[PDB]
Structure formats: structure tokens, C-alpha cells
Structure 1
Amino acid sequence: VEWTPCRPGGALCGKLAVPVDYDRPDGDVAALALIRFPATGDKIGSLVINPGGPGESGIEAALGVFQTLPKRVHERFDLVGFDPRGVASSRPAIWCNSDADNDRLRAEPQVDYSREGVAHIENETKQFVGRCVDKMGKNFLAHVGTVNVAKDLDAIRAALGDDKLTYLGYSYGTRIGSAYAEEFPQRVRAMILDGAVDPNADPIEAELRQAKGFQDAFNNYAADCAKNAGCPLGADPAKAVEVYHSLVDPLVDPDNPRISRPARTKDPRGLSYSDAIVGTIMALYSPNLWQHLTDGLSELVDNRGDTLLALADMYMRRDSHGRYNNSGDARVAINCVDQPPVTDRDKVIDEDRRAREIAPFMSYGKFTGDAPLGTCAFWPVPPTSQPHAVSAPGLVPTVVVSTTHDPAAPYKAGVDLANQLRGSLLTFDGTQHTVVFQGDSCIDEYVTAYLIGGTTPPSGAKC
């Protein structure tokens, strides 16, 4: 890696060639993008981070993390972020949808699960899968999975000149983590995994646990908002879900589920039902976004949807000029190869029935008896990994940070990951997704002592 100054720090950027196929090590070649924030004091090595997604830029994430990085950490480590294969500035980047493709989907209510509804959705999905293939070719898509990301990470480890890896993983970055840990356990110096993905989980039970997370986060937000003046969801939190549906269901034509009646916005699109739901989910990632959610809901009372639309844009990575990054398309590609998709329709139908019961705030109308299959059931290349209990006997003790009411990565996922890893579980008491290097003194001290000293939190450490 020949470094070079970036395009906001002492930042150096560079690129690193890895092979697309690792069995064809002289075949097609991908170029990963890297950012580097040189340590200020005495350098132990590099702290490599991943934000998750998948499809999220690590370069982008390092620039944020740099802002909230404890002084001692910044002294002891080069902060290093990378864009994984197919993601953001890495070439080739995964691309399936155009900006117009994305907008067209987001305009739909996406709520009709009748036979005709399921056929419509399942048709847009096929068109999507076809767009991925035509633009990427099946070979590249076959090799975008985490198992190969893990191999690139070691190539990264070596190119940065560290003998052993120091790694901070967030959310899906957690799966990159346990993967690298299983393949190169003897190359791991230290590892923090925050907001855990449990690779031994059943995907349907996981998704349902996630539904339950967001409903429970919904409940927490609403209870909190009810203490406040003019709560758009009302002063009785036991009726918040009903009030919420009185605000969002009018965005769907009651005589016809496929017709958007968007709330007015200064943006030309207005606010569809599906955008409304996506904005809500986005806001429930963090209590920091609750104010915005409340604003959006209050706008809905006056038939306006500007804040919810902006929340949905934040989630979908659509900038002010209507442009998308490739996080969405990459997200799908990578998720589809990391595990075998649910292909049994009865399973998908029964999941739907349960989810409406578990997360009503998210569900529109009644169970129909039909449900679409997910994009992955149509993937033209097979998975390159599969659910299993993480096993890395030789691994150094690691830290898993799990938040008690994390909607995206539920607390018990993090416990389970810790156990398979036989590392330390650091608990955060909150309703948010991830927490490391995000302002909390306690968490950050624990993480700093582990990263520098090698010191794990005591059993039962809460924060």
C-alpha cells in the first residue's frame, strides 16, 4: 500500500489489491479502499474498524469514529477504516438499482399481501436480481460474502504491518469479526464486537426477535414521549400503536392497498406509508433520533411528512440531490451469500403471521395468508457460509458489548456470541443499537483498557 493524503485529519488513503476468487489467485482482482489516522503517541499498531450494514463504508465510519476516539486510543493506534469488497469506494462496487429504481419502490405502500400483491412484489424482486447479474456478473457476486471479507482483512492486517489484528466491529461488523476469529485465531491481538450477530441463529427466529426488539423500542419511545408535552402518540402509551396507525394508515388508500396517498412534503415525492415505517425504524436506532420521530409524527397530524421522509432518506442513503450510495444493493448481495435463504413459502407465511402479532406498529391490516419471499430466495449464486456455533478455541479473550434493549441486535444475541467466543460480555443499559465510542464514559474506559492493557471487564460488568 502506497499511501497518499486524502481528498480532515492527518489522513492517509490507499488501495489494496486482493483477488476476487481466492482459489483463482491470479484471476480477476478487486481493489479495497483504505483510510488511515496515524497515532499521535507511541504506536502499538492499527485499530481496524467496521461499521456493519453490510454495505456501509468503513472509511466513512472511521471519519466519524475519529471525532469521538478517546485520547489514549488515538495515541496508541493508527485508526484504520476500509470499504469491504463491493462496498463504496472499493472496486468493483456492487450496483443493481438506479436512483429511479429505488424511488419507484419507495413510492409504493408495499402493504398488499394478497396473491396479486405477493406476485407484484415477487416480480420486482426478480427484476432486481436480474439487474445485479447484468451489471456485476455472477462471478463477483459469488465472492462478496463475509468468508472472503475475512480473508481480505488478513491481507489488510499484513499490509498495515501489524503482526496481529486489533479490530473493532459494529453490528454486522460483528460477523466479520467472528469469521476472522475462526479462520485466523492466532492473528487476533484484541477484538471488540458491539451489537452482536449470532451466526448460529435460525434466520426466521432471529428476524422475529428483531421485530420484537423494534416493537419494544417503539414501546420505550412512546412511553418516553408520553411524559412530554403534546405527544403525537397520546399521553397513554398503552394506546400508542393504535394512535400511530391512525397517523400512518391514511397514507394508504383504504379501498385499495396498492395506492399511495402520500403526506404532503416540500420534496416532490411526498411521504408514502413505506417511507413512514422506514423513518420510524431508523429513529428507533437511537434515543438521539426520538426528537425527530416525534417531529415527524406531529407533522403527520397536519398531513405533512417532511421529517419522516428525511428519516427514511437517512436510512436509505439518498442524498439531497436524489443520489443513492450503493449500501442497499451491496447490503443485499452480501447478506444473500452469507447464509442459505428461506425458500419454503409456508415458513415465510408463518413468519408473517407471527410478526404481525409481535410487532403490530410495523404491520398493516390483517394477516392475509400469503407473504412474499425475500430477495435472497431468488439469488443466482449459492451461499458461501452457513449458520453454525462459532468455534475458535485458541482465540484471545474478546469483548462483546450488548445493549439491553437493542432493537437491531437484541441483548441475548450478544450473550450467545460471548459464550461461543468464551469472551467477556459488557452490558449497556439502553434502547439503542451499538454504543462503543459514542459518548459513554464507562463503555469507553472499559474498551480503552482492553485495547491497550488487554484487560477484560469483570464478569457482570454493567454500564
Structure 2
Amino acid sequence: FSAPRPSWRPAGDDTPLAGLECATVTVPVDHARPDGPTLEVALARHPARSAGRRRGVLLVGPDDPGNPGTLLVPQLVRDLPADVLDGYDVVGFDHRFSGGSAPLSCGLTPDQWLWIFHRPQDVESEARFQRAVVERCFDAAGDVLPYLTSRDIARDMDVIRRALGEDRISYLGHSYGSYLGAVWTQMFGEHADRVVLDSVIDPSSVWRRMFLDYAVSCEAALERWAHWAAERDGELDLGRDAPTVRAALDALAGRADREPLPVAGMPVDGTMLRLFTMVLLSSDRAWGFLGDIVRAAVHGDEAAPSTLRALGAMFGRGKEESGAVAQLGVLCGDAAWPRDMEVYRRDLAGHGARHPFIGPAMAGPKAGAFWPVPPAEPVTVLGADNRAESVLLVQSEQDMFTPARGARRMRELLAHNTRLVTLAGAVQHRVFPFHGDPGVNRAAAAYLLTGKLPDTDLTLRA
């Protein structure tokens, strides 16, 4: 496919990309039909600060499906070690049908944007709720949704590499970006220079198995936070023991299921409240925020303005329906979900009830069960034939969203070309470089700049 060189221009100082460059790259909707329709994939670049030390391009993928990867470049400019920013053009992209790359709008209600985490009433009612999301999105975008897959994004990534005029390219990806990098190396690894995958999705869990295991991780994180909160009943007044704290949290969410809780003039229902809980759960540096909002909502008080500025971030003016549709296409389209409602009925009553905070939303009949198109391709198989010269895995020992088991699995599947750096003591998600750990950042920067993996898998302590 014809990949002309991008037309870089300074991003406006009225944008979150101020100080960077912006461009688009043309990709075909159907990579098998390169003369068919196309779309423009948005890019953002921070050029290497030192031409004499320039190694090439560090391509950066989105960290969640639907999350604009261009917005990672300012975060990376802020936190990356200086010699990395000296040596690489940092180039982030918004994956097809998200962000500024032809985002989709299908008329979804705000309640439907949270289809992943939606609390079910029963199998019958949730099957109706989730199928409705599918039929709504296919009514408005059924022409392109079959081309919103992880492998098609990986195809876009190689068009971008060629449009940038690079024979070899480096890659950094977090969470979903770790999977995009893995898939891209399996498909195009002969073009890989240095690769860092951080907070590593288990590539054998695509995707329902990941849903089910997340319910377990969430329970474990809630138990560690309930103990932490219990040790602080003298500030939060939620209980002097974890089960008492959990019971308060549980009842709060139960009321929110009945009646939306007014938070700074916006209704917060049980699904939204549980989502805010889980996001704050994922980093122990955010556990104080969680204590604050639970304390306030329980006692009918107001949360600190700082706490609300995290809530306004995830469900106020920032939020986008385009992200929910992007999640739908990737999560339902990469692999065929079980169609039989018996599977979901049983898993709700067993696994869901055993992991009650988010288990029911994870085990019940999700939109993928009702997908109207067959899978276009198998799930990418990672293995010994991966042609990437080297891949560094970076992983927090305690990560609620992408547990360390996924990184360990990737380390086995790609045993021939990977090394694993684990950060112990970290209750964190997305480590390099945003966590600011000197050990992790030094090791990852040395690899990116020398191309040398650690001699052995490393376990560092924060």
C-alpha cells in the first residue's frame, strides 16, 4: 500500500499536543483492498533532541482501546529519561476508529458507554442490554466495525513505519499497547529495532478469559485496600477491620445501583462508582483519593476538590463515546465469544457470585456473544517464530489491570528474544516511565539506547 511521507506541522498551542508536531498517515480500511476506502491515522511526534545521537523512531501505541495514543507523547516527554528523548523521535498514534483517527459515534447512551462494566440484573435482561449496544453500533458503523481489530491496527503500524521512511523501528506500549506491540512483532518483527512492552496483557486470554480473571484481580486489590483503610478508621471512619470497610463500600455501591449518587452535580450510579473505585484501586498512590470519596459519600459529605478533579476527568467533559465503540470492536471482534447463554448463566452464578464486586459484569452475557460477523482471522499466535531481535518486558508485581502472570506468559511464549524486569512492592499499572522508578527507568533506557537486554530477568524493589 502506498505510504507517502507525512506532512508534519506544529500542533496548536490550543491543543494538548502543544510543543509537538502533528500529521496523519493514510491507511486502507481493508488492507486486502488497498484501492478501496481509506482513513487518516493521526500522529504526534516529539523529535529526537540530538541528531548526532538519534537512533531512529520510538513508535508508541495506545494504552487502552479507544484511548488516543497521541496523548501519550506529552506524558512521555514529561517522564522519559533524558537520553531516550535525546535519541528517539517519539511518535504516538491514535489507532483506527478512535481519537482523531476517524472516531465513531453511534448514538450510545452514557449508560451504554460502560458496557464492559455494566452490572447485570439477570442473564435475560443483560443479554438484551448488551445485544442492544451491538445492534446500535452496527446500525451506525457496521461498514467499518469488521475492520477494527488488533491485527488491522498492527497492519496500520507497519504502514506508519514505512510512511516514516524507517526500515527498522522501535516500539513502546502499555497494557493494550503491549498487546499491539506483541502482535506487530509477530506479524512484522523483522522490522523491529528495540521493543519495550509494559504492563503486559496475557496474549492467551483474548478476550473473555481476561474479563474473567480481572474479576479475581479486582477482589484481591479490594482486600488489600480494605485493610489499608481499616488501619485508618481514625481518618475515614469506615471500619477498623477490612470486612467492615468492604461492607460499607458494598452498601454504598448498592444504594448507587438504586439511586444515582450526586457528585458535583452529576449522577453517579453503581457502575460508575465501581469504575471510579477500580481505577483508584489500581495505584496505591491513589488509595487516599479512594478513601476520601468513600468516606464522603458514606457520611453524606463532599469529597476534596482534588478527589473530584479525578472524577471529573473520567466522566465529565473529557469522556468520549468513541472510546466505548473502539473497545467494542477490538474486544468483540478479535475473537469469537461463546454464543451459548448457558455458559454465561452458569458463570454468573458461580464465578460472578464468588467475586461479587465486578464478577457479574465480567462473567455474564457480554456484547461479544451477539456479534453479527464471524471472526475475520484467528487470534494472533505468539511463539518461537517471532522475528523481533529483542523485546524487553516491564511489569509491576502487583498490577490489578494487567497482572504479572501475563508478563510471565509472554516471557515463556517469546522465550527466545525476551527479558523480564519486575518491580516489586509496586501496586501500579503502567510502570516505565510514568511510575518514576529510577531502577526500572535506568534499565529500560539502557536497553533502548544500547539494544542490550539484561543478562537475566531482573526483579527490582521500588
TM-score (norm 1): 0.87
In the TM superposition, residue 174 of structure 1 has moved relative to its aligned partner by: 1.4
Tell me the residue number matched to 1:27: 36
Tell me the residue number matched to 2:420: 425
More strand by share: 2
**Is 2:110 aligned against 1:102?**
yes
Q: State how 1:376-455 maps to structure 2 within 5 Å.
A: 376-387=368-379, 389-391=381-383, 392-422=385-415, 423-429=418-424, 430-438=426-434, 439-455=436-452
Tell me the residue number matched to 2:154: 150
Per-residue CA deviation, residues 197-254 of structure 1 (Å, 9 max, x unaligned), is 22223744432321111111112222222333323442212443223223322334xx
Alpha-carbon spacing, 1:313–1:337, altered in 2? closer, same or farther (3 Å): farther
> Residue 462 of structure 1 aligns to a residue in which SS?
strand
Distance 1:242 1:331 in 2: 32
Distance 1:68 1:212 in 2: 31
Residue 105 of structure 2 contacts residue 322 of structure 2 at CA under 8 Å; is this kept in 1?
A: yes
- Paired residues, what number? 439
Deviates more, 1:437-446 or 1:279-288: 279-288
Per-residue CA deviation, residues 402-421 of structure 1 (Å, 9 max, x unaligned), is 22111111111110011111
> Residue 34 of structure 1 aligns to a residue in which SS?
strand
Distance 1:104 1:398 in 2: 37
Tell me the residue number matched to 2:3: none
> Residue 66 of structure 1 aligns to a residue in which SS?
helix
Alpha-carbon spacing, 1:24–1:388, altered in 2? closer, same or farther (3 Å): closer
**Is 2:135 aligned against 1:130?**
yes
Residue 113 of structure 2 contacts residue 321 of structure 2 at CA under 8 Å; is this kept in 1?
A: no
In the TM superposition, residue 134 of structure 1 has moved relative to its aligned partner by: 2.6
**Is 2:63 aligned against 1:90?**
no
Distance 1:240 1:350 in 2: 29
In the TM superposition, residue 9 of structure 1 has moved relative to its aligned partner by: 5.5
Distance 2:124 2:231 in 1: 44
Tell me the residue number matched to 2:323: 327
Distance 1:72 1:110 in 2: 44
**Is 2:56 aligned against 1:45?**
yes
Residue 403 of structure 1 contacts residue 411 of structure 1 at CA under 8 Å; is this kept in 2?
A: yes
Q: State how 1:363-378 maps to structure 2 within 5 Å.
A: 372-378=364-370
Residue 215 of structure 2 contacts residue 359 of structure 2 at CA under 8 Å; is this kept in 1?
A: no
> Residue 195 of structure 1 aligns to a residue in which SS?
strand
In the TM superposition, residue 46 of structure 1 has moved relative to its aligned partner by: 1.0
Residue 207 of structure 2 contacts residue 331 of structure 2 at CA under 8 Å; is this kept in 1?
A: no
Unaligned runs of 5+ residues in structure 2 are 1-5
Per-residue CA deviation, residues 301-352 of structure 1 (Å, 9 max, x unaligned), is 223586888656544x5416xx625211111112211111122222222322
Alpha-carbon spacing, 1:110–1:188, altered in 2? closer, same or farther (3 Å): closer
Deviates more, 1:341-350 or 1:30-39: 341-350
Q: State how 1:298-337 maps to structure 2 within 5 Å.
A: 298-303=295-300, 314-315=313-314, 318-319=316-317, 324-337=320-333
AA aligned opposite 1:280:
T
Distance 2:201 2:359 in 1: 25
Residue 62 of structure 2 contacts residue 94 of structure 2 at CA under 8 Å; is this kept in 1?
A: no
Alpha-carbon spacing, 1:447–1:106, altered in 2? closer, same or farther (3 Å): closer
Alpha-carbon spacing, 1:104–1:48, altered in 2? closer, same or farther (3 Å): closer
Tell me the residue number matched to 2:23: 14
Alpha-carbon spacing, 1:196–1:218, altered in 2? closer, same or farther (3 Å): same
**Is 2:181 aligned against 1:181?**
no
Per-residue CA deviation, residues 345-379 of structure 1 (Å, 9 max, x unaligned), is 22222322343454333468xx9xxx741111122
Per-residue CA deviation, residues 378-401 of structure 1 (Å, 9 max, x unaligned), is 222332343464123432121111
AA aligned opposite 1:406:
D
In the TM superposition, residue 28 of structure 1 has moved relative to its aligned partner by: 0.4
Distance 1:460 1:385 in 2: 33
> Residue 260 of structure 2 aligns to a residue in which SS?
coil
Tell me the residue number matched to 1:245: 250
Alpha-carbon spacing, 1:264–1:33, altered in 2? closer, same or farther (3 Å): closer
Residue 40 of structure 1 contacts residue 74 of structure 1 at CA under 8 Å; is this kept in 2?
A: yes
Distance 1:388 1:184 in 2: 12
Residue 337 of structure 1 contacts residue 383 of structure 1 at CA under 8 Å; is this kept in 2?
A: yes
> Residue 245 of structure 2 aligns to a residue in which SS?
helix
Alpha-carbon spacing, 1:291–1:384, altered in 2? closer, same or farther (3 Å): farther
**Is 2:304 aligned against 1:296?**
no
Distance 1:414 1:373 in 2: 28
Deviates more, 1:441-450 or 1:219-228: 219-228
Distance 1:127 1:309 in 2: 32
> Residue 165 of structure 2 aligns to a residue in which SS?
coil
AA aligned opposite 1:34:
L
AA aligned opposite 1:342:
P
Distance 1:104 1:181 in 2: 34
Distance 2:35 2:433 in 1: 40
> Residue 261 of structure 2 aligns to a residue in which SS?
coil
Per-residue CA deviation, residues 59-114 of structure 1 (Å, 9 max, x unaligned), is 111122211111000100011100011011012x222234xx1157779x964534
Distance 1:380 1:304 in 2: 47
Alpha-carbon spacing, 1:158–1:105, altered in 2? closer, same or farther (3 Å): closer
Tell me the residue number matched to 2:82: 71
> Residue 326 of structure 1 aligns to a residue in which SS?
helix
Unaligned runs of 5+ residues in structure 1 are 253-259
Alpha-carbon spacing, 1:362–1:331, altered in 2? closer, same or farther (3 Å): closer
In the TM superposition, residue 35 of structure 1 has moved relative to its aligned partner by: 0.5
Tell me the residue number matched to 2:264: 266
Per-residue CA deviation, residues 416-446 of structure 1 (Å, 9 max, x unaligned), is 0111112111112222222111111111111
Residue 185 of structure 2 contacts residue 387 of structure 2 at CA under 8 Å; is this kept in 1?
A: no
Distance 1:156 1:145 in 2: 17
In the TM superposition, residue 39 of structure 1 has moved relative to its aligned partner by: 0.9
Alpha-carbon spacing, 1:355–1:241, altered in 2? closer, same or farther (3 Å): farther
Sequence identity (%)? 25
Deviates more, 1:219-228 or 1:185-194: 219-228
